[PDB]
């Protein structure tokens, strides 16, 4: 359930981290999914190909554009495939930060939250800005909107949200369309305030949501903006005052203080956001309230600790040499989606070392040794 208020504003490039992997462990003749997970990049424009034997795979899908707390984007490109002995797979990524496309080969051998993410990217001459909105309950996407898609409707991405009737979808479609129209205005407004040319492409990002404890009672709320991956204005934890990053955001801050925008946001974050998060947790209890403990194992190099098929994504993998936390000389890979609702992770640093796994689905933390 989105916010029914779109206040207008008044008034650094990051290269993608790439991971290529399969959904399940590879077994010849067994149908699987080949994933390429790009993350931590800015701006959002990116070209991702899945390669099979030095050739592009035709039918490749990808997740809806979302971003992290630091405003950097992440995407999951995937396709169904049956691996065999001869076939070799890789992922090729092109981005403004790269002098040439990077290829990465596939090595065959509690609390709850609701979040809404909004991205609008200007395309001068090419048409109206590309607007993408996604909604999350914890680490599960359940709604989306894409301005270039055919439906021009808010679409379901989880089974438990398909229950909702036409009044729900009409309202969310109305609100998300007004979201995009406001960000379109914000793009043209921010271009002039920063004295930028009309030909360049720019990005505005909006994020808001609410956290609840295990008692489903309000904990914290968020409502922040970014321009070109840089903090612009954010609502503080008290939900009453604003943090402005630079002089352009000070004008927006004063306009929003005079219009009492924070009062309307606090009512949403403390009340409406919590109310519908509780409804979603109930309607999708089979999916949202499950815990899946990580299937763990270890491998030795000629030491890598693995964790697979766990939910939620929150996990901790630490290395200990004789009990002391060995932070240095430790390669920790970012948690990645398997594509079926579960997640994966591994860390790398013989009998003196141990791997510690902490996860909500585990009765007690696990220790792994060679």
């Amino acid at each position, epitope marked *: 359930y989105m916010l029914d208020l779109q206040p207008e504003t008044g008034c650094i490039q990051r290269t993608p981290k790439i991971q290529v992997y399969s959904r399940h462990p590879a077994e010849n003749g067994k149908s699987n999914f080949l994933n390429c997970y790009v993350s931590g990049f800015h701006p959002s424009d990116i070209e991702v190909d899945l390669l099979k034997n030095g*050739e592009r795979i035709e039918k490749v899908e990808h997740s809806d554009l979302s971003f992290s707390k630091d405003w950097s984007f992440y995407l999951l490109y995937y396709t169904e495939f049956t691996p065999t002995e001869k076939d*070799e797979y890789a992922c090729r990524v*092109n981005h403004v*930060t*790269l002098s040439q496309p990077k290829i990465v080969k596939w090595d065959r051998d509690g609390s709850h939250s609701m979040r809404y993410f909004f991205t609008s990217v200007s395309r001068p001459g090419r048409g109206e800005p590309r607007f993408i909105a996604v909604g999350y309950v914890d680490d599960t996407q359940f709604v989306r909107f894409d301005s270039d898609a055919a439906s021009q409707r808010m679409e379901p991405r989880a089974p438990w949200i398909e229950q909702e009737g036409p009044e729900y979808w009409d309202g969310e479609t109305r609100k998300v369309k007004a979201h995009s129209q406001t960000l379109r205005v914000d793009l043209g407004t921010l271009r002039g305030c920063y004295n930028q040319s009309e030909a360049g492409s720019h990005t505005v990002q909006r994020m808001y949501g609410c956290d609840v404890g295990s008692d489903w009672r309000f904990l914290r709320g968020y409502h922040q903006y970014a321009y070109d991956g840089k903090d612009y204005i954010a609502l503080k934890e008290d939900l009453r005052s604003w943090t402005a990053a630079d002089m352009a955001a000070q004008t927006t801050k004063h306009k929003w203080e005079a219009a009492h925008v924070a009062e309307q946001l606090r009512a949403y974050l403390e009340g409406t956001c919590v109310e519908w998060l509780r409804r979603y947790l109930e309607n999708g209890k089979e999916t949202l309230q499950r815990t899946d403990a990580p299937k763990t194992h270890m491998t030795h190099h000629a030491l890598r600790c693995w964790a697979l098929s766990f939910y939620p994504a929150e996990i901790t993998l630490t290395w200990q040499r004789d009990g002391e936390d060995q932070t240095q000389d430790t390669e920790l890979v970012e948690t990645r989606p398997a594509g079926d609702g579960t997640f994966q992770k591994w860390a790398a640093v013989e009998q003196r070392y141990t791997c510690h796994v902490q996860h909500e689905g585990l009765p007690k933390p696990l220790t792994l040794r060679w």
Partner: nanobody, 115 residues
Framework: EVKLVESGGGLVQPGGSLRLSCAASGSIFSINTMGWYRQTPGKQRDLVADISSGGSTKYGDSVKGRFTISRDNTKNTVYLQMNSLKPEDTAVYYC??????????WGQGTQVTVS
């Protein structure tokens, strides 16, 4: 191991045409997809056109309809027919190839300038 020999660039008038050519050395079983990227004004190089050994093609949006890639798959040589050239097509066009193990090879590039 693999060497890519490029030719066919140079100066051309607006509306004119050029035919780039790229021949791969070594075994025929050493290269699958062959094609071209071109240097953007900044750091990046953008996809122009490439073709698999089976003849599967892909074009960048800014050259669709005007550029045509073809392949004489006896010699692992690909040809890029660049029609209706504009000043915005001016760049260094890098030939590239993919091995059947997804190793990428890159040529030195050929400057293309449209008056």
């Amino acid at each position: 191991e693999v060497k890519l020999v490029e030719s066919g660039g140079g100066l051309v008038q607006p509306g004119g045409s050029l035919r780039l050519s790229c021949a791969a050395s070594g075994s025929i079983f050493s290269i699958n997809t062959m094609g071209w990227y071109r240097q953007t004004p900044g750091k990046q190089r953008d996809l122009v056109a490439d073709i698999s050994s089976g003849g599967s093609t892909k074009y960048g949006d800014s050259v669709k309809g005007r550029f045509t890639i073809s392949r004489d798959n006896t010699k692992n040589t690909v040809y890029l027919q660049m029609n209706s050239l504009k000043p915005e097509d001016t760049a260094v066009y890098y030939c590239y190839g993919l091995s059947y193990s997804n190793d990428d090879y890159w040529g030195q590039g050929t400057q293309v300038t449209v008056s």
